[PDB]
Structure formats: C-alpha cells, structure tokens
Design a protein around this ligand. Structure first.
Ligand SMILES: [Mn+2]
Ligand SMILES: [Mn+2]
Lengths: 151, 290, 290, 151
C-alpha cells in the first residue's frame, strides 16, 4: 500500500445494479502502529471539492463486510488490521464527475492506555494538541482522478 | 469468467506501466484494482515479471490469478514473452531450443486465458530485425498456437516505419504461410509528431499518418497505446489520438488499445503513474464510448 | 527450535521500532533477517500488529512463524498485548470480559513460544494508573498464566518513577499474592538525564539512578532498552547505559533488553531505522559480550 | 524490499562452522522491469571502503542455491525474479569490522532485444552512454553498518 493515508487505489464511483450511480468509494489505511477494534473507531467528516458530507452518509467496509457508524460503535470483537485499508462508501447520487477531485477526510480512534489529557477532546476533525506520528493525523487530504465521460 | 463484449476497439492497460511500482508499492492485486478504478478491462502482463515462480506457477497461484480476473472484471488480452536465442553468451540457441521455449510460453499464456502474445526476439542489425531463423522458430510453434487460439505478434515501434523492411517482411511471411495466428502489434509511437525543442530524434524516424495503418489492420491483433504527455484537459499532446482511434474505429478494428507509458519520470520519487494512466483513460473512454 | 543460552542479560529488538516500515517496506521476515544481521536473538511483537488474522491465526501461519524463528535464530521473548476495558465508548468491560480477552492473549502468546507479556491497561488518572479492577483482572488470569509459564508485566516508563505509587502498588500486589507470574517491565526512559535545550520535560519526571532498580530486579522479567540518540562512536547520549547495564549484570538479571526506538524521525522520509538499531546494538554487544 | 539496489537487509559477516569469519554477504535486487536467466547476468567489481574485490571472489545465491560466475554463465533455465533479491557472498578472511562501510558494486545483464549499439560495450563496471531507468544503473553504492565487537 501507500504511505499517504487516503489510498490512490480504490477511488471510484459506485453503480446500482440498475446502472444508476449511487455514490463513490475510497480506501483509508489505519495510520497506527497497531490494529483497533471497530468500536474504537471515530469516523469524522468528509470534504469533496469543498462540499461537506457528514459521517451518517459514509459506511465502513472492513474484512469484506459493510458497517454503519452505529454498528461499529458496538462491535469490539471485529479487528481492523494496519495492512488492510478500510473501504469508505459515500452516499451521493450521481457520484463525482470526470477529472480531478480534492478530498479531505477526518477520523481518529481511541487509545485508552494514553494519558487522559491526550484522550480527552479527541476530535476526528481536529488535530491533537501535540502530534505524535505513530498515531497519524486525524485529517488527511489527497488529489485523485475519476474516470468518467464528460457531461 | 468475466467477458467484455463492446464492439470495436477496447481500452486496457499494460502492467509495464506500473514498472517502478510493481513489487515495491503495488502488488499484482493493486494493479488489477487500479485498472478497475479506470473501468479498464483489457490487460497485458509480462511473463518474466507477473507470473509468480515463472516459468512454473503452481495450481494454487493460477487459480488465484483467475479469481483476480473475475473479481476485477479483467480480460487477459496480451501476454508479453521473449524468445531470447542470445540468452547464452557463448552460443545461439538452436531452432529447437527456441521453439521449446516459445511453445512453453504459448501453453502458459493459454492457461492464464491470454489470446495474443507480444513476442520480442533478439535483434541483429539497426533496423531491429530478428534473428535469421525467426521464420523457422515461428513455423515450429504455429500449429500449437493455432490449436490453442493464440496469435503471436512482434511489436512495431519507433524508429521502424509502417512501410519499411521490418513490417513488410512480417506481412510477406503471413501471406506465404496463410496463417491467421501470426500478426502485428502496432505501438502508437509510430504516429508521434510533436517533440521537445532540443529532444533528440532518430534521423531514421518519420511519423506515419493514421491512414498508414489501414492496409495492415487485417494483421493487427493488439495495439500498444503508447503516450508521452497528458494535458490537464485529458488530451495527448504528442500523437494524433483522435485521428488514430477514429481510423481504427472506421476500418474494422476489434482489438484492444493497451496503455503503455515509458517516461523516465516513472522512476522519480513521488511520481503517481496511476494518476497519469487515469488521465490517459479519460481520453480513451471519451474516444471509444466505454 | 533455536535456544539462546548466554548467561546474564541478553540483547534483542522490539518490532515497534520498525513501526514506520512494517507493512510498507519491511515484511515480518524482513524484520527477522534485520535482527539476524545484528546478531540479536530476542524479539518483542505486538499482538495487534504482527500476528496475521489476529486474533485467530491459521495453523499454516503459526507454523510459518516457528519456521522464521528457527531460520533466523529468534527467541520469542516478549508479547505485547492490551486489556482494553475502554474499547467500548458506552461502557466499561466487565471483569469477566477483560479476563476472557486476557486469557485469549495468554494462549496465543504461549502458542507462538513467548514467555513474557507486556500488558498495557487503560489509565484512569495522570499517574497512568490502571483501571480499578486491575487486581481482579490479573487474578483471574494468573492460574492460566502460571500453568503456561507466562509472566505478565505492565511497563514502567517516564514520567513514572521507580519509587512512586504505580511501582509500589504492583510490588505490593506481587508480595500479597506471592505470584511468580506477575512482574515489571522497566523502560530505560526512567534513567534519562540529558535533554535538548528547549525540550519540554514533564515537571513530574525525575531521573532514577541506575542503582534505583536494584530492589526491583526480583520482579523484572523483561526490559525495554529505550534509546534516543546514538553517536557515530556508538554510544547513547541521553542515558547512562554503561552504568545501567553493569548494575543489572552485577545484580543477577537474566532477561532481555529489547531495543525500543520511538523518535518521530521514524516517520520522516529517507529514515533508515535499521541503521539506527545497528548503532544501538553495537553498543549493546560491546557491553554484554554477545 | 527497498528502492535502492543494494539492500539494507542481509548485510552481515559469514561464519565457518568452526567459528572463523570467512567473508560477508549483501543482497542486490534486480533493477529491471523483468526477470533474467542466470546466463544473462554479468557480475562486475566490488569496492568495500575503497578495497577492490574481483568477481572471482563473489558467488551469487538465487532461489536458495549458490552459483559461481562460471556456473551462472552456462545456466539459461534458472530464473532470477525482480522481487527476489540475490545474495552475493564475498570471500574475505576476517570479514568487516564493527561500524560503517561504504559499498560500491557493479553488475549488469544482457537484453538481446535492444538496439545493437546499446548491447555493445555493455560493461558491468561502467554506465551505458544514455541512461534508461527501467534498466537501473550498473554501479550502485550504499553506506551500511556491521555489528561486531571492537578489535
Ligand atoms: Mn511498446
Ligand atoms: Mn517502552
């Protein structure tokens, strides 16, 4: 995989069955030195070309299975491995057009063994006071290309 | 087994593009998913690069390969092999040794579902002509190739012209034998018109016109869509792509055009060839419809 | 099964050092061969990082693991796990849930041949103290741990002092129970004397003297050899390494000292942590004899 | 593996059985876009801290098996894969001392499908006239560390 958190591979539109575009997906790698259980994850907010998209519009696919934020908040037995990037599927009718797109995504995860100053105010959309790179940045960006015909 | 049945020319990628990345940052599966993001279905692999434990893969690996094809909607299109008679420093390989090695690659290509072979041979002069026994080598493998539905194709590329000795010697051979299992792979560098100021250009190279390909399309079974530079408007700035693709549409081509990118920035740090290829496939999709 | 029978302290590496590299440029086998180049035999892995398909590896993967140990002369020494009662946002985990998760990790650690567990627990205050039921959690797993020859050890590190509440509460527990399967892992950051001008230092941290460890060595089963900077003369410039290692030699220590490097340059491009570790192990070999 | 041709992993001294140091090894990755057969390889000359070492002192280990330059020149059926770095074992009694060492190694390989200007004067110790990075540099360097006691 790639050093960047948002992966260049797996960024595409999503079709329906009935052929209609329902959204798009992209992969995020866990930027942690260890895996986490699903209930440790705290999905944040997406920005695509400045358009804001809330977490209630984004599901996580890990180990072949799709989870909602709610499903995930309760599952402390399913394990996300550092080497198995999660696939985020974003609800958006019509998808993204041909060409470039700027992505800004935020998420973080809990680490209850850390000092309690650190664990508090742990916001998936805002960086920690001091930055330790073994935990990665909560917010990451990437400029990626979508292949589609011109409208 | 996934099948792609668009009529006319179809787009694809040649994994030679992921050349700085393969084995380092992309796996074979990463390359498949990268083609998937593009909507590309056709693929070209290199025998000595992408088949694990080449030349003798396991039954486990082969089945993993077919699963990847189904999972990402990939059609094995072209399989790139070498008949290296000069592999030994002290001697040439006999015709029989060359045919045994060629036949072996034909089997592997068929097992992995490929249907065209891009066969590269040692060269003896500066026109890039093959070893003198090349007619004998190919004639030795042609019955097996016809049985297994494979078409062997040497690659025509700069500085070779679409109407020089190299092409006509191959076309002459096809006509004398009558075989439908030998043919040509045209690499789009033969239509390149724009170069950089100060960029050296082989005094023997002359661009061909897109129409120059029309009498050869009976014998063209797969094309390398070479490209040098994609603008941010997703146009190729060195080759008359619209005119080449339209010529082939209008004149009955049903093969693939497989992206081949050979720029040296491939190997500069930070280069994202997957993005470059997506540019090239935005153009390709717009010209073909799919 | 390879065994390392030097007397006294032995050197090793904690794969947490390969933290920017694991899964990107080094594989698990690369890490083993990297320890081999160093002559290091002891290893520490992290359960949630280095066991494929954690928490349920296959019989195939486990046997590959043992083959790696034999092939590179690696002794599974310390196995780092978490008892995360706070894994759920809405509630704490009951004592039974915590013990079921701990017991599970004890089994996996034993199967992979490990003999010390570096157990990290959620913290409730700023002295880094464990969840209040920690005595109950450990007492639940102690019979299994004693059966399987494992020693569970929380890690003592800055700002915690070798004679603060945190250490003495653990030592008190060992004495009241009498268990020989609970104990301490001392991380060498507790002896750090030199810092940079302008480098913030926790007002609660006081360096310990190397002798401060002597009454605890009965309870120390594995140490993290933390280190900050290696000179080009292969000396560590922030911790009295000679004096710490000699104290432990002279006072009967037979465990490992496992290199742990946590610098942020780990994640800068071009950083070669394998070289940094080789520096650290030139020092370690010179102090120990092997 | 690593992008550099000489690998940081696998650089160590070599012992005897009877405990005496006989030499050292290091790994080289094929910097080619395809594999080669053993008979295509042209091993060149090594420099360790400026000390010159001829190819007759260096064996190649590929696919678990050790080959001499002579054995290799005749074997056109054994295949070196791009992802399986070769292990070069260098004859040198006593090996290398504790600490840093500068390595300069040269080797190349034949490509009979290339224009015949290119294939001629193909020297494992000298770079080709024009440089194509899909073939790599014939000569590569690396500063690596050896772990040993001080003498
Ligand atoms: Mn080509
Ligand atoms: Mn530590």
């Amino acid at each position: 995989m790639e050093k960047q958190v948002i992966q260049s591979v797996g960024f595409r539109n999503i079709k329906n069955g009935n052929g209609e575009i329902t959204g798009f997906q992209f992969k995020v790698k866990l930027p942690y030195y260890r895996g986490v259980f699903l209930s440790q994850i705290r999905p944040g907010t997406l920005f695509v070309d400045g358009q804001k998209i809330e977490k209630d519009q984004i599901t996580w696919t890990i180990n072949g299975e799709e989870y909602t934020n709610q499903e995930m908040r309760g599952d402390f037995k399913t394990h996300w491995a550092t080497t198995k990037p999660a696939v985020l599927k974003v609800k958006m009718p019509g998808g993204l057009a041909q060409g470039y797109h700027d992505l800004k995504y935020g998420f973080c995860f809990t680490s209850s063994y850390m000092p309690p100053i650190i664990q508090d105010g742990l916001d998936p959309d805002k960086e920690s006071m001091v930055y330790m790179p073994e935990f990665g940045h909560h917010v990451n960006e990437r400029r990626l290309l979508i292949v589609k015909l011109a409208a | 087994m996934y099948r792609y049945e668009k009529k006319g020319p179809k787009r694809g990628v040649a994994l030679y593009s992921y050349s700085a990345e393969f084995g380092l940052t992309k796996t074979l599966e990463d390359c498949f998913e990268d083609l998937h993001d593009m909507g590309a279905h056709g693929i070209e692999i290199l025998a000595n690069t992408h088949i694990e434990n080449y030349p003798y893969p396991t039954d486990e690996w082969v089945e993993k390969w077919w699963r990847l094809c189904d999972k990402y909607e990939i059609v094995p299109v072209e399989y790139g092999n070498w008949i290296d008679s000069h592999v030994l420093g002290d001697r040439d390989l006999t015709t029989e040794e060359s045919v045994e090695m060629l036949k072996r690659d034909i089997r592997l290509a068929h097992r992995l579902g490929f249907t065209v072979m891009r066969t590269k041979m040692p060269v003896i002069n500066d026109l890039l002509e093959p070893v003198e026994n090349w007619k004998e080598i190919i004639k030795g493998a042609l019955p097996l190739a016809e049985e297994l539905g494979i078409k062997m194709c040497p690659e025509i590329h700069t500085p070779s012209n679409l109407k020089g000795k190299l092409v006509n010697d191959f076309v002459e051979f096809i006509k004398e034998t009558g075989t439908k299992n030998f043919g040509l792979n045209i690499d789009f560098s033969v239509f390149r018109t724009s170069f950089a100021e100060g960029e050296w250009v082989d005094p023997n190279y002359t661009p061909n016109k897109p129409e120059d390909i029309i009498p050869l399309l009976p014998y063209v079974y797969c094309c390398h869509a070479k490209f040098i530079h994609m603008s941010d408007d997703f146009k190729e700035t060195t080759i008359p792509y619209e005119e080449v693709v339209k010529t082939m549409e209008d004149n009955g081509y049903e093969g693939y055009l497989l992206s081949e990118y050979e720029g040296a920035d491939k190997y500069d740090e930070g280069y994202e060839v997957g993005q470059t290829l997506r540019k090239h496939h935005i153009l390709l999709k717009n010209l073909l419809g799919d």
